[PDB]
Amino acid sequence: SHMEQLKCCSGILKEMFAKKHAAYAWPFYKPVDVEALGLHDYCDIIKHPMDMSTIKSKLEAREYRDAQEFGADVRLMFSNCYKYNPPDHEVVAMARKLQDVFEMRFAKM
């Protein structure tokens, strides 16, 4: 059921925003501020930017037909981090930690 799926998707994103995962989930809360120092080339490398607040708004505006469409945006957010940043950057390790939380929840639904 697509309706039951999207309510579970809202639940997964709720845990991702919770205090428990806050230590590594904070860089993915809001869209990447391209006006900040060191992020002048972000728009040149990342063509489709995605973050948790945009996903939350897209769920509320019913922009996802099913769980797979929600999952695609969550993975786009992580893939943007892996593409733009160097492999040894701290944000890449944080992305892996938050993706572990998502992948385990997304598989068990």
Ligand X SMILES: Cc1[nH]c(-c2ccccc2)cc1C(N)=O
Give the x/- contact pattern for ligand X in 35-74, rule: CB under 6 A: ----------------------------------------
Q: Is 43 buried (19+), middle (13-18) or exposed (0-12) by CB count in 10 A?
A: exposed
Taking CB under 6 A as the rule, does residue 85 contact ligand X? yes
Interface with ligand X includes 84 (CB under 6 A)? Answer: yes
The dihedral formed by the CA atoms of 81, 28, 90 and 45, expressed in degrees to the nearest 10: 30
Q: Strand (E) positions, 1-109?
A: none
- Binding residue (CB under 6 A) for ligand X from 27, 53, 66, 105: 27
Q: Which residues bind ligand X (CB under 6 A)?
A: 27-28, 32, 81, 84-85, 91
